[PDB]
Design a protein around this nucleic acid. Structure first.
Ligand SMILES: [Mg+2]
Length: 801
RNA sequence: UUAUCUAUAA
């Protein structure tokens, strides 16, 4: 129900000077006065509400507001530094924008900043005081810029193509820490739609240099693709803003709507004819479809050539792989560069001269908060083979030179299925690919003996299943099927569907480009995946170098939900460790309500995993460590309540007497906390990021509760994101050190690479499982749940790697 | 689909 208090502060690891993008706030101990606004109409967007309030204050300066500078959240909440002269009697006013709005205002409450001050000093926090402050800090930026969630953006020019742009901006949030309010400031970038004529948008989306080419009506594929892009976007009439709900199938010349004549009789009129009569405009592109806008009942159709994409619309739909890359490149920058850009932003913002921030007596320090971090020692990684070598991670990285798998699978029989045309992937490549792959495999401790028992070409996803059917029936003890692919193909989804859910055969895909040109590291990394799919153990944590939680049987869980890019379900995935290393993880997966973050059927999934744990280890875990992927800030209270109880329920419906301690940990990567090295000698790599294993549980952390930051990974590009961990529940009474080290060591058990990853393997695996479930669904609730279900032989292994 | 990190999420 309520999160546990911080048990202690960590002492493990060597100290390191850090700077966080948290700026200390000096806040008065006054009382803010909270007024409620009811504006009619009641569903105008926040910007309209803000200008209504802006004009309202200036208009009623004489008798109401005077010299005061109130702040406003854009909805119903308005705050003042000192009380307005109306006591508590509601007041009805009328505001005029260039049209009329009835605005009532009644005093509702006071917000004590003193109540916050001591909430920051024991007294185990008022969310409403934090919200009031938040409204003060972001009142001026809300008028000045384009707000998006907790961020602000403006147009600077930076195209991603396909009618999209990169706008730069910043995140802003007011955050509690011990003995201070903090202002979290980070630079940000996000995708926006270009403000352009829809015609040009059609060109960029359909790759037209000129609308003049394509002088004919769109194909069906052209049309609906254009539909998916513009659908839901707002357009404006050059001639009034509208919401596009659909694109017509018919061209403007033949698309019709019911038009009532003066006789009262309605007749079907074409869009082209209507615009010719009513607006005296002859359509230049009548062969193109129309935009359906507003309520569908209204039959409102707009020609493309009279519409512009409305400025300031953030792109939410998934970017193409190239759009993503261009965005990554344009936004990525080293830790020092980011640290400087934040500084510039602080100078530029200049919060101390902000009238509203001044009005409420607030002050913001221009220096980044100094924080002492602790670089935890990494675990040793025990390999096997003849050598039994131990790897010592350096900078969150290690390798397999002169090392062999803990338990390497001795592969004897295996097949190859190449879906690339031999025109590009001749038998030359396959046999050299095989030769190089085996030498690396020999060295890896997972030796592939003998040439592949089977190697054929094939094409089309239509041929996967029968080809796979053939293989399992004709080759005894067939261990692996190496599939080769061209590029992005639906064959992949089919290969995984048949392989994971139907026949239960281990399949390893690889692209044609990688087939042609093989490097040892790429091959070695490919062997990492292959070995675990066949039930091998690449490596394990050094058993003696483990936290004491492993003293008694324990299961490690990872949970996450992947959401669709309407009417498609979200997919919940929960993985569970099946041994004491811990290496092997069993997956559970559930389809559920569209965009529901809460794992509905979690109790059944935990039950299932506890059974499998017992079946694998003959032990019932005395402790359940639950790493839950990040959740929306309101949803924390919702998630904790349903899912913590679901976990308890699983234990009880298993046995009345079964009651293991649960540790519920939310792991967040989606925040804007950035940590920088104070001393340049501590910078790692070209990106100059903090070293792997850096842990912060002081200064910027929660005043009462048990949370910490842990940057477990090496920062390769841009600025690192230290994963935030928040313990919402802990029966096991973990110390700070043991939990932090446990978490850090679990980040070294990720089998797809010999590096410490940014989150613990369980959480990462959960994401892989949920993501793999999408591909299983590519081909009605009963059917979907079934299509997601994995083959029971496959369920043993980590097929998702 | 070798892999981590990385910016979003009328
Ligand atoms: Mg998630």
């Amino acid at each position: 129900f309520k999160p546990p208090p911080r048990p202690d502060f960590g002492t493990s690891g060597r100290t390191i000077k850090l700077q966080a993008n948290f700026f200390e706030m000096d806040i008065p101990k006054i009382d803010i006065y909270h007024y409620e606004l009811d504006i009619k109409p009641e569903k105008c967007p926040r910007r309209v509400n803000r200008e209504i309030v802006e004009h309202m204050v200036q208009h009623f300066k004489t008798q109401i507001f005077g010299d005061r500078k109130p702040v406003f959240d854009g909805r119903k909440n308005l705050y003042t530094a000192m009380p307005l002269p109306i006591g508590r009697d509601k007041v009805e006013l009328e505001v005029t924008l260039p049209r009329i709005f009835k605005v009532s205002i009644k005093w509702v409450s006071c917000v004590s900043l003193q109540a916050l001050h001591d909430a920051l000093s024991g007294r185990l926090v008022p969310f409403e005081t934090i919200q009031a402050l938040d409204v003060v800090m972001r009142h001026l930026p809300s008028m000045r810029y384009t707000p998006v969630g907790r961020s602000f953006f403006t147009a600077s020019s930076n195209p991603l193509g396909g009618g999209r742009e990169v706008w730069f901006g910043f995140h802003q949030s007011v955050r509690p820490s011990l003995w201070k309010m903090m202002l979290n400031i980070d630079v940000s970038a996000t995708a926006f739609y270009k403000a352009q004529p829809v015609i040009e948008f059609v060109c960029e989306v359909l790759d037209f240099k000129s609308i003049e080419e394509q002088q004919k009506p769109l194909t069906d594929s052209q049309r609906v693709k254009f539909t998916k892009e513009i659908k839901g976007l707002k357009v404006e009439i050059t001639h009034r803003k509208y919401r596009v709900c659909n694109v017509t199938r018919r061209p403007a010349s033949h698309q019709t709507f019911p038009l009532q004549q003066e006789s009262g009789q309605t007749v079907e009129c074409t869009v082209a004819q209507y615009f010719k009569d009513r607006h005296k405009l002859v359509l230049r592109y009548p062969h193109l479809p129309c935009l359906q806008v507003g309520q569908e009942q209204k039959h409102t159709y707009l020609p493309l050539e009279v519409c512009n994409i409305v400025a300031g619309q953030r792109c939410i739909k998934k970017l193409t792989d190239n759009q993503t890359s261009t965005m990554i490149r344009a936004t990525a920058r080293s830790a020092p560069d980011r640290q400087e850009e934040i500084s510039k932003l602080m100078r530029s913002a200049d919060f101390n001269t902000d009238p509203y921030v001044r009005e409420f007596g607030i002050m913001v320090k221009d220096e980044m908060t100094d924080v002492t971090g602790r670089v935890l020692q990494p675990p040793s990684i025990l390999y096997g083979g003849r050598n039994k070598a131990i790897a010592t991670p350096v900078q969150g990285v290690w390798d397999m030179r002169n090392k062999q798998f803990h338990t390497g699978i001795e592969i004897k029989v295996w097949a190859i299925a190449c879906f690339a045309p031999q025109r590009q992937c001749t038998e030359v490549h396959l046999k050299s690919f095989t030769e190089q792959l085996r030498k690396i495999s020999r060295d890896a401790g997972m030796p592939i003996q003998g040439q592949p028992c089977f190697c054929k070409y094939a094409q089309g996803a239509d041929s996967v299943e029968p080809m796979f059917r053939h293989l399992k029936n004709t080759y005894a003890g067939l261990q692996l099927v190496v599939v080769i692919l061209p590029g992005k193909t639906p064959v992949y989804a089919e290969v995984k569907r048949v392989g994971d859910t139907v026949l239960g055969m281990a399949t390893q895909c690889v692209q044609m480009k990688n087939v042609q040109r093989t490097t040892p590291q790429t091959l070695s990394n490919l062997c990492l995946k292959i070995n675990v799919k066949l039930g091998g153990v690449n490596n394990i944590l050094l058993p003696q170098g483990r936290p004491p939680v492993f003293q008694q049987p324990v299961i490690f869980l990872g949970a996450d939900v992947t959401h669709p890019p309407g009417k498609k379900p979200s997919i919940a995935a929960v993985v569970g460790s099946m041994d004491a290393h811990p290496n092997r993880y069993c997956a559970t997966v559930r389809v559920q309500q569209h965009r529901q973050e809460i794992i509905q059927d979690l109790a059944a999934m935990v039950r299932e995993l506890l059974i499998q744990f017992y079946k694998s280890t003959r032990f019932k875990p005395t402790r359940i460590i639950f790493y839950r992927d990040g959740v929306s800030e309101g949803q924390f209270q919702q998630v904790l309540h349903h899912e913590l109880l679901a976990i308890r329920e699983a234990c009880i419906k298993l046995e009345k007497d079964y009651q293991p301690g649960i540790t519920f940990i939310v792991v967040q990567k989606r925040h804007h906390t950035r940590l920088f090295c104070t001393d340049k000698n501590e910078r790692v790599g070209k990106s100059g990021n903090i070293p792997a294993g850096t842990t912060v549980d002081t200064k910027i952390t929660h005043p009462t509760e048990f949370d910490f930051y842990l940057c477990s990974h090496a920062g390769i590009q841009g600025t690192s994101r230290p994963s935030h961990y928040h313990v919402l529940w802990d029966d096991n009474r973990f110390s700070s050190d043991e939990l932090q080290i446990l978490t850090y060591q679990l980040c070294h058990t990720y089998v797809r690479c010999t590096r410490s990853v940014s989150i613990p393997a369980p959480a990462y695996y959960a994401h892989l499982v949920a993501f793999r479930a999408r591909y299983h669904l590519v081909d009605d609730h009963q059917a979907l749940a079934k299509a997601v279900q994995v083959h029971q032989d496959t369920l043993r292994t980590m097929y998702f790697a």
